[PDB]
Amino acid sequence: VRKLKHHEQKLLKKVDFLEWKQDQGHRDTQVMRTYHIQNREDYHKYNRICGDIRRLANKLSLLPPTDPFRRKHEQLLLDKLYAMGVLTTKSKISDLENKVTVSAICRRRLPVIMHRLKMAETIQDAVKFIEQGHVRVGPNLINDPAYLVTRNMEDYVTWVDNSKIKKTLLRYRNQIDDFDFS
Amino acid sequence: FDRTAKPVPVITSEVTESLEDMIRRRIQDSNFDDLQRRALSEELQKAHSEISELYANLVYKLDVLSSVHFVPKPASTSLEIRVETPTISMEDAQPLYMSNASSLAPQEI
Amino acid sequence: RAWDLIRYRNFRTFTGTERIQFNCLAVDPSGEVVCAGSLDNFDIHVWSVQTGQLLDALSGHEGPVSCLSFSQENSVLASASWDKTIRIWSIFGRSQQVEPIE
Amino acid sequence: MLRRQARERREYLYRKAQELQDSQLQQKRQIIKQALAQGKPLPKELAEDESLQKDFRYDQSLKQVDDEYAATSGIMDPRIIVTTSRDPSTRLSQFAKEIKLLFPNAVRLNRGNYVMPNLVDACKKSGTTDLVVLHEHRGVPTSLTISHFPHGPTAQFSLHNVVMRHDIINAGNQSEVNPHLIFDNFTTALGKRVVCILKHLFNAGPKKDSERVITFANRGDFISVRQHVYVRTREGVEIAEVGPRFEMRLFELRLGTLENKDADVEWQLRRFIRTANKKDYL
Amino acid sequence: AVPSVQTFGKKKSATAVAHVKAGKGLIKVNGSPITLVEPEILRFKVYEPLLLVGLDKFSNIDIRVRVTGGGHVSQVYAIRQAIAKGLVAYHQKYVDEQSKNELKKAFTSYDRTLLIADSRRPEPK
Amino acid sequence: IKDMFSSAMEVARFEGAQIKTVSGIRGEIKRALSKPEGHYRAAFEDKILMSDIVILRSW
Amino acid sequence: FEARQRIEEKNKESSDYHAKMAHIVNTINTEEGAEKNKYERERKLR
Amino acid sequence: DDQVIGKARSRTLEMRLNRLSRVNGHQDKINKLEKVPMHIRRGMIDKHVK
């Protein structure tokens, strides 16, 4: 705390007031900083789910490699996570242990889908825009940033009609038709 | 002089008859390239039971996380039996009833 | 799936070959035909009720079929989907006619 | 469905690039599978990396039609639109009639003032699968283009020795039953891809006593198309020639529909290379 | 600081942008007045959004239409659709909603192609 | 291509041959033209220029 | 007609030439690298 | 194998892969020990030798 002198640094080597061992390297903080996660327990509520997928893939790999219960359930879990967007491809089954990850479940959120769809400039501005209530999926407006937008359901992320942001991009390309409110 | 490509083959009686008995051999041998219309162990049964329970709980919380837009599991032609019982007894507990037939048809009897 | 309210049984289950989740259905007046439309498929699945098979799949919407109905008198199918389009299918009797209304 | 089909193409070609990228893992996984099968040593690159082995514990429980037709190969019968070029001549309209008789589940569309972009959009949202576009040269039909519609492949062929069922004689009507198919010495991988293209536009599963056969016989990159009916007599088979006969040559196969001409080419005919007339299916 | 409302009309390849603002009453197509729209036998196709609802609707607004593309009859059809939905949109925004959907009822009872064009064609029979 | 033959009979005699320009752009004689007598249509690898000389090597 | 005859006779000629030269290159490699390796096998024991 | 359930399966597979790998792979890199601290790896060894 005072940049210990040399005999002190030798005499108390394990002292660290910020980084502890149970913090696991502050990855809750670090990936919630990356994806701009609002409240604190979302990382760990996703981590329970990654733990459940990895536990099941462990127990399900422990079965013999030939039996159809193993093969069928690994394929069901693999297609389930790929259609949920948590996985990127269903090629190999070691993706169930290596590449399922809280950052994957977070990349599947709604502000991040907004940013990767170019509907905002950054994930903080996407969080601001859907806190301000511009973004609907399908017909109904979505208001919380934690919404998880699956592979089929990211074809329906749009803005609401009558939104000032929809008005300003149409009038940027001066295609604004004021008949249909925007 | 040299020429670029082999010219288009002229279609004479020899190549039509070689083509035709190719078809005759294929069609009497029925070689057609068609389209085609589409208990274990005690320790293994209890391992299977454990990961069946785990997979059911996980699919439940994946669906409630995925805000139940998802894609369903395919199909299972299962087999369920039903005893012959009055549909008064196949109801809920209230003072009334709704139908008083039996749960098996005449032809099922 | 169909429910007989006399013997309290599920006497039919109609599924598509695609494993999609249905969000609206509409039955014929004389309950020969049951149609159902999803929110992720753009087709309208038409099953027969007597033989349990899939009779056809009506395609032509370019958005999720939001609501269906069968006209109780002349038996025409009015579907309506999120592509801003309502669409009137004459299904029965040699026609196979579609009429879009924007 | 415009957004959905755009990103479905985007995801499929991402998966395609990923598989060709990490298909060295498929073969070194097969190498250590056969090394555990016959107990022989593991080469040094596989022996020193700990990651692929502890992934092999999971990947041990892994493991024909191609990528565009796989989702509905034998399940759904095709639906085929047959159309001509634009302002067609009368022998081309007769040829398009004969081609729609050749393929069952094929209807014929009248072409005129149909932009091929919105013809592709109309076709692939009314749910057809194939489109066959025919091109003429003063009567004589010179090309046909087969397009498989959920962003699938287009094979463009040129037709060469065309004799038509109209132009022979008043011989009666055709059979229109679901035919058998004959595909002769399509030996190379392009030949198998073209066999898949060409046979996934007939209805699946003909009858075993179906009396109508239609043959595609490759003879030096010239697929000779003949159609036949028969009756199996007591000594052999008596073959009768119904329907149009021609020779189609594949000159292009690309990986999008007709509308773009920005599709990644799978195979287009290299005509002026130095070794042009030495190899077949070049 | 001035009220203005822009709408679009379209037929086969014609396009027609109509700007409606609060004005003196002047209707202009491509800079020339509305009474010089050719081919002069479809001038009443251009005139019918005006005469359907009366010129007292137009007597305080002034519309101007820029038309591009198409042929003669595609241009008069895009002009009349632009005029109609421009007047309805101005009445939604800066005048009252009662008058807006009275205008919608008038134009839709005459023909709703004054307000909605036929957009995606054809049919695979 | 303008004048290496004098008539449609000569071009018919030499159909399908491989020609090339002096810039190495390969090509092939496709068809005798109709209206001028010794002219023909050839298809090259890519767009040749007006300043080039096509060439038919023969023995 | 002369197109087809000349192209097929050319391809037969070239596919015989490649066979002949690959044959003599491979026999010179095999049955004389045997002698070269035999001599170096009897020069490493000197 | 096709009958060996979990922990025996994972360690049989790990044993076989180490035994096949030891022929060509480097001796310094085939047997990596787990990063265990000094005062508890020495303790594990002392109690195990006892």
CA distance A155 to chain C (A): 10
CA distance D268 to chain E (A): 31
Token pair for A124 = 């903080």
Q: Where is C26: in which H helix or E strand?
A: strand C22-27
Q: DSSP readout, B36-69?
A: ------HHHHHHHHHHHHHHHHHHHHHHHHTTT-
- In this complex, whether D and H touch, counting 3 or more CB pairs under 8 angstroms, is yes
Contacts of residue C25, defined as CB under 8 A and 6 or more positions apart, other chains included, come to C34, C35, C36, C37, C68
Q: Is B2 on the interface with D (CB under 8 A)?
A: no
CB-based contact C63 D2, cutoff 8 Å: no
CB-based contact C102 E119, cutoff 8 Å: yes
* DSSP label at residue A53: H
Q: DSSP readout, E39-107?
A: TSSSHHHHHHHHHHH-TTTGGGEEEEEEEESS-HHHHHHHHHHHHHHHHHHHHHHTS-HHHHHHHHHHH
- Which of A56, A147, A152 shows the shortest C-beta gap to B51? A56
SS3 B1: coil
CA distance A123 to A34: 9
Q: DSSP readout, H7-36?
A: HHHHHHHHHHHHHHHTTTS-HHHH-PPP--
The answer for F24, left when phi > 0, alpha when psi is -120 to 50, beta otherwise, is: left
Contacts of residue B79, defined as CB under 8 A and 6 or more positions apart, other chains included, come to none
CB-based contact B87 C8, cutoff 8 Å: yes
CA distance E92 to D277: 72
* DSSP label at residue A5: -
* DSSP label at residue E7: E
How far does CA G41 lie from the centroid of its chain?
26
- Which of H2, H3, H9 shows the shortest C-beta gap to A62? H9
Residue D24 CA: distances (Å) to CA of A91, D43, D46: 13, 14, 12
Phi, psi of E43 (to 5 degrees): -65, -25
- Which of A61, A66, A154 shows the shortest C-beta gap to D58? A61
CB B57 within 8 A of CB A59: no
CA distance D146 to chain A (A): 30
Q: Residues of C with CB below 8 A from B99's CB? A: 5-8
- Long-range CB contacts (within 8 A, 24+) of E48-51: E48/E80, E48/E110, E48/E114, E49/E80, E49/E83, E49/E84, E49/E87, E49/E107, E49/E114, E50/E83
Q: Residues of A with CB below 8 A from B55's CB? A: 56, 60, 73, 76-77
CA distance C68 to C90: 14
CB A46 within 8 A of CB A106: yes
From the CA atom positions of chain D, what is the Rg in Å?
A: 23
CB-based contact E122 D81, cutoff 8 Å: no
CA distance A135 to A119: 10
CA distance A43 to A27: 9
Token pair for D24 = 């060295």
CB D78 within 8 A of CB D105: yes
Helices (H), A39-179: 42-61, 68-83, 102-107, 110-116, 123-131, 164-172
CB-based contact B35 D239, cutoff 8 Å: no
CA distance B46 to B41: 8
By CB atoms closer than 10 A (0-12, 13-18, 19+), residue D246 is buried
Torsion of CA A108, A113, A117, A123, to 10 degrees: -130
CA distance A56 to B50: 9
CB-based contact D35 H20, cutoff 8 Å: yes
Give the F-side interface with D, CB within 8 Å.
18, 26-28, 43-45
Q: Are strands A157-159 and C2-4 parallel, antiparallel or unpaired?
A: unpaired
For residue D257, count other CB atoms closer than 10 A to its CB.
Answer: 24
Token pair for H8 = 């025996």
Q: Tokens 């591009």 belong to which residue?
A: E68
- Within 86-145 of A, beta carbons closer than 8 Å to B belong to none
CA distance D130 to D200: 9
CA distance A56 to A77: 9
Provide the sign of the torsion angle of the four alpha carbons D11, D15, D16, D18, taken in this order: positive
CA distance E56 to chain A (A): 21
By CB atoms closer than 10 A (0-12, 13-18, 19+), residue D97 is middle
Residue B34 CA: distances (Å) to CA of B37, B54, D80, D250, F43: 9, 44, 18, 21, 39
CA distance F26 to chain D (A): 6
Q: Is A44 on the interface with B (CB under 8 A)?
A: no
User: Max CA-CA distance within chain B?
Assistant: 104
CB D281 within 8 A of CB D194: no
Closest listed residue to residue E82, CA positions, set E22, E25, E34:
E34
CB A156 within 8 A of CB A137: yes
Q: Residues of D with CB below 8 A from G14's CB? A: 278
Q: Tokens 């660290």 belong to which residue?
A: A16
Provide the sign of the torsion angle of the four alpha carbons D136, D141, D147, D148, taken in this order: positive
Give the experimental resolution in Å.
3.4
SS3 E117: coil
The answer for D76, left when phi > 0, alpha when psi is -120 to 50, beta otherwise, is: beta
CA distance E39 to E72: 7
CB-based contact D126 E123, cutoff 8 Å: yes
CA distance A15 to A59: 39
Helices (H), E6-42: none
Token pair for H35 = 């990063």
Q: Residues of A with CB below 8 A from C40's CB? A: 152-153
Q: Tokens 């996980």 belong to which residue?
A: B58
CA distance B70 to chain H (A): 31
Q: Tokens 């035909």 belong to which residue?
A: C33
- Indicate the domain borders of chain E: 1-125
CB D216 within 8 A of CB D223: yes
SS3 A126: helix
- Which of D160, D204, D230 shows the shortest C-beta gap to B27? D230
CA distance A37 to A51: 20
For residue C62, count other CB atoms closer than 10 A to its CB.
Answer: 19
Provide the sign of the torsion angle of the four alpha carbons D13, D18, D24, D26, taken in this order: negative
Q: Which amino acid is at B61?
A: K
Contacts of residue D68, defined as CB under 8 A and 6 or more positions apart, other chains included, come to D148, D150, D151, D152, D153
CB D82 within 8 A of CB D106: yes
Phi, psi of D112 (to 5 degrees): 180, 135
CA distance B4 to A80: 55
Q: Is A33 on the interface with H (CB under 8 A)?
A: no
Q: Residues of H with CB below 8 A from A62's CB? A: 5-7, 9-10
For the stretch D124-133, what's the b/e string if a residue is b when 16 or more beta carbons lie within 10 angstroms of its beta carbon?
bbbbbbbbbb
Q: Are strands D80-84 and D106-108 parallel, antiparallel or unpaired?
A: parallel
- In this complex, whether C and A touch, counting 3 or more CB pairs under 8 angstroms, is yes
* DSSP label at residue A62: S
- Residue in chain D lying closest to A91 (CA): D19
CA distance B91 to B99: 9
Closest listed residue to residue A92, CA positions, set E62, B88, D22, E100:
D22
For residue D252, count other CB atoms closer than 10 A to its CB.
Answer: 17
- Residue in chain D lying closest to H26 (CA): D48
For the stretch F41-56, what's the b/e string if a residue is b when 16 or more beta carbons lie within 10 angstroms of its beta carbon?
ebebbeebeeeeebee
CB-based contact D73 B4, cutoff 8 Å: no
Residue D168 CA: distances (Å) to CA of D5, D162, D224, D246: 45, 11, 18, 14
Q: Residues of D with CB below 8 A from F18's CB? A: 272
CB A109 within 8 A of CB A145: yes
Token pair for D36 = 């555990």
CA distance D282 to E4: 64
Q: Tokens 């800079």 belong to which residue?
A: E31
Q: Residues of B with CB below 8 A from G7's CB? A: 3, 6
Torsion of CA D120, D123, D125, D127, to 10 degrees: -140
Residue F36 CA: distances (Å) to CA of F1, F3, F28, F56: 11, 10, 19, 20
CB-based contact H29 D39, cutoff 8 Å: no
Contacts of residue D181, defined as CB under 8 A and 6 or more positions apart, other chains included, come to B32, B33, B34, B35, D199, D202, D213, D214, D215, D216
CB D56 within 8 A of CB D32: yes
Q: Are strands E15-22 and E4-10 parallel, antiparallel or unpaired?
A: antiparallel
For the stretch A98-132, what's the b/e string if a residue is b when 16 or more beta carbons lie within 10 angstroms of its beta carbon?
eebbbbbbbbbbbbbbbbebebbeebeebbebbee
SS3 A109: strand
Query: How far does chain D reach from its first CA to its final CA, in angstroms?
Result: 38
CA distance C80 to C66: 6
- Within 13-72 of C, beta carbons closer than 8 Å to A belong to 39-40, 64
Contacts of residue H7, defined as CB under 8 A and 6 or more positions apart, other chains included, come to A62
Closest listed residue to residue D230, CA positions, set D175, D182, D185, D183:
D175
For residue B67, count other CB atoms closer than 10 A to its CB.
Answer: 15
E1-125 architecture in CATH?
2-Layer Sandwich (3.30)
CB-based contact H3 B43, cutoff 8 Å: no
For residue A163, count other CB atoms closer than 10 A to its CB.
Answer: 19
CB-based contact D230 B3, cutoff 8 Å: no
CA distance D55 to D104: 49
Question: CA geometry: angle at A170 spanning A165 and A174, to 5°?
Answer: 140
3-state per-residue secondary structure call for G1-45? CHHHHHHHHHHHHHHHHHHHHHHHHHHHHHHHHHHHHHHHHCCCC
Q: Is A62 on the interface with H (CB under 8 A)?
A: yes
Torsion of CA H20, H22, H26, H32, to 10 degrees: 100
Q: Tokens 């940049």 belong to which residue?
A: A3
CA distance C52 to chain B (A): 14
Contacts of residue D178, defined as CB under 8 A and 6 or more positions apart, other chains included, come to D104, D202, D203, D205, D206, D207, D210, D212
Q: Is A63 on the interface with H (CB under 8 A)?
A: yes
In sequence order, what are the beta bridge partners of C47? C34, C54
The answer for B22, left when phi > 0, alpha when psi is -120 to 50, beta otherwise, is: alpha
The answer for C42, left when phi > 0, alpha when psi is -120 to 50, beta otherwise, is: left
SS3 A152: coil
CA distance D152 to D13: 11
In sequence order, what are the beta bridge partners of C85? C81
CA distance A165 to D75: 45
User: Max CA-CA distance within chain F?
Assistant: 29
Q: Residues of A with CB below 8 A from C39's CB? A: 138
Q: Residues of A with CB below 8 A from C82's CB? A: 138-139
Provide the sign of the torsion angle of the four alpha carbons G20, G23, G29, G34, taken in this order: negative
3-state per-residue secondary structure call for chain D? CHHHHHHHHHHHHHHHHHHHHCCHHHHHHHHHHHHHHCCCCCCHHHHCCCHHHHHHHHHCCCCCCCCCCCCCCCCCCCCEEEEECCCCCHHHHHHHHHHHHHCCCEEECCCCCCCHHHHHHHHHHCCCCEEEEEEEECCEEEEEEEEECCCCCEEEEEECCCECHHHHCCCCCCCCCCCEEEEECCCCHHHHHHHHHHHCCCCCCCCCCCCEEEEEEECCCCEEEEEEEEEECCCCEEEEEEEEEEEEEEEEEECCCCCCCCCCEEEECCCCCCCCCCCCCC
SS3 A32: helix
In sequence order, what are the beta bridge partners of C69? C78
CA distance B43 to chain H (A): 8
- Residue in chain D lying closest to C56 (CA): D76
Please name the chains neighbouring D, where neighbouring means 3+ C-beta pairs under 8 angstroms: A, B, C, E, F, G, H
Contacts of residue F45, defined as CB under 8 A and 6 or more positions apart, other chains included, come to D272, F25, F26, F27
Q: Is A154 on the interface with D (CB under 8 A)?
A: yes
CA distance C26 to C47: 11
Helices (H) and strands (E) in chain C, counts: 0, 10
CB F28 within 8 A of CB F43: yes
- Which of E120, E122, E125 shows the shortest C-beta gap to D107? E125
Where chain A is discontinuous (C–N > 2.5 Å), the residues before each break are: none
How far does CA D186 lie from the centroid of its chain?
12
CA distance D110 to C96: 19
Residue D226 CA: distances (Å) to CA of D80, D155, F17, G9: 20, 19, 31, 30
Please name the chains neighbouring B, where neighbouring means 3+ C-beta pairs under 8 angstroms: A, C, D, F, G, H
CA distance D96 to B41: 63
CB-based contact A64 H10, cutoff 8 Å: no
CB-based contact A138 C39, cutoff 8 Å: yes
Q: Where is B24: in which H helix or E strand?
A: helix B13-28
How far does CA D162 lie from the centroid of its chain?
21
How far does CA D114 lie from the centroid of its chain?
24
CA distance D122 to chain E (A): 6
Asked if the peptide bond before residue B7 counts as cis, ω within 30 degrees of 0, the response is no
